Design a protein around this motif. Structure first.
Motif, PDB file in Angstrom:
ATOM      1  N   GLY A  69       0.798  -1.222   0.000  1.00 56.04           N
ATOM      2  CA  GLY A  69       0.000   0.000   0.000  1.00 56.04           C
ATOM      3  C   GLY A  69       0.828   1.269   0.000  1.00 56.04           C
ATOM      4  O   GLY A  69       0.404   2.300   0.515  1.00 56.04           O
ATOM      5  N   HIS A  72      -5.774  -1.973  -0.198  1.00 52.23           N
ATOM      6  CA  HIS A  72      -5.131  -0.672  -0.458  1.00 52.23           C
ATOM      7  C   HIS A  72      -5.811   0.082  -1.604  1.00 52.23           C
ATOM      8  O   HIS A  72      -5.396   0.002  -2.765  1.00 52.23           O
ATOM      9  CB  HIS A  72      -3.641  -0.892  -0.762  1.00 52.23           C
ATOM     10  CG  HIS A  72      -2.903  -1.570   0.352  1.00 52.23           C
ATOM     11  ND1 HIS A  72      -2.974  -1.137   1.659  1.00 52.23           N
ATOM     12  CD2 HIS A  72      -2.045  -2.614   0.347  1.00 52.23           C
ATOM     13  CE1 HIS A  72      -2.182  -1.880   2.412  1.00 52.23           C
ATOM     14  NE2 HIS A  72      -1.605  -2.783   1.639  1.00 52.23           N
ATOM     15  N   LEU A  73      -6.833   0.856  -1.241  1.00 53.96           N
ATOM     16  CA  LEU A  73      -7.632   1.596  -2.199  1.00 53.96           C
ATOM     17  C   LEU A  73      -6.870   2.558  -3.096  1.00 53.96           C
ATOM     18  O   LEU A  73      -7.090   2.560  -4.300  1.00 53.96           O
ATOM     19  CB  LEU A  73      -8.759   2.335  -1.466  1.00 53.96           C
ATOM     20  CG  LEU A  73      -9.470   1.514  -0.379  1.00 53.96           C
ATOM     21  CD1 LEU A  73     -10.609   2.352   0.173  1.00 53.96           C
ATOM     22  CD2 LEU A  73     -10.018   0.200  -0.935  1.00 53.96           C
ATOM     23  N   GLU A  74      -5.971   3.344  -2.511  1.00 51.54           N
ATOM     24  CA  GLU A  74      -5.181   4.321  -3.254  1.00 51.54           C
ATOM     25  C   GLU A  74      -4.311   3.654  -4.321  1.00 51.54           C
ATOM     26  O   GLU A  74      -4.251   4.103  -5.481  1.00 51.54           O
ATOM     27  CB  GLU A  74      -4.301   5.114  -2.298  1.00 51.54           C
ATOM     28  CG  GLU A  74      -4.469   6.620  -2.430  1.00 51.54           C
ATOM     29  CD  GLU A  74      -5.613   7.176  -1.577  1.00 51.54           C
ATOM     30  OE1 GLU A  74      -6.757   6.664  -1.679  1.00 51.54           O
ATOM     31  OE2 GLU A  74      -5.363   8.140  -0.813  1.00 51.54           O
ATOM     32  N   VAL A  75      -3.624   2.584  -3.934  1.00 49.11           N
ATOM     33  CA  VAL A  75      -2.786   1.870  -4.894  1.00 49.11           C
ATOM     34  C   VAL A  75      -3.660   1.294  -6.028  1.00 49.11           C
ATOM     35  O   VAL A  75      -3.296   1.348  -7.220  1.00 49.11           O
ATOM     36  CB  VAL A  75      -1.978   0.753  -4.188  1.00 49.11           C
ATOM     37  CG1 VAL A  75      -1.372  -0.193  -5.218  1.00 49.11           C
ATOM     38  CG2 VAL A  75      -0.858   1.388  -3.352  1.00 49.11           C
TER      39      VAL A  75
END
Ligand SMILES: [Cl-]
Ligand SMILES: [Cl-]
Length: 97
Positions: free
Chosen positions: A22, A56-59
């Motif tokens: 992440g 890991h939403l952002e990744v």
């Protein structure tokens, strides 16, 4: 089914690790430097799968924007979305919808 998590050399291996961990800045830098978003580990997991396995939403958003195949399947025939469903992470599933 049971949950699928991942906390238990070249740029590809590094991108697989950055995504699994992440670490968004690492992911940005590595892709900029030619890391292949289609890289796969032993289990046929792509960086998108490892980011998904650990929520890991952002990744996940960065990989998709860089052109990662949202429908890539691992050796089990699962996509990142399938993983989010198995793990019960609706925040993630909504992003891969
Ligand atoms: Cl930050
Ligand atoms: Cl993240």
């Amino acid at each position: 089914h049971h949950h699928h998590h991942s906390s238990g050399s070249d740029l590809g291996k590094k991108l697989l690790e950055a995504a699994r961990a992440g670490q968004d800045d690492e992911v940005r830098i590595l892709m900029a430097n030619g890391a292949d978003v289609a890289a796969k580990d032993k289990n046929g997991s792509t960086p998108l799968h490892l980011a998904a396995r650990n929520g890991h939403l952002e990744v996940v958003k960065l990989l998709l924007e860089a052109g990662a195949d949202v429908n890539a399947q691992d050796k089990f025939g699962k996509t990142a979305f399938d993983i989010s469903i198995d793990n019960g992470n609706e925040d993630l599933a909504e992003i891969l919808q």
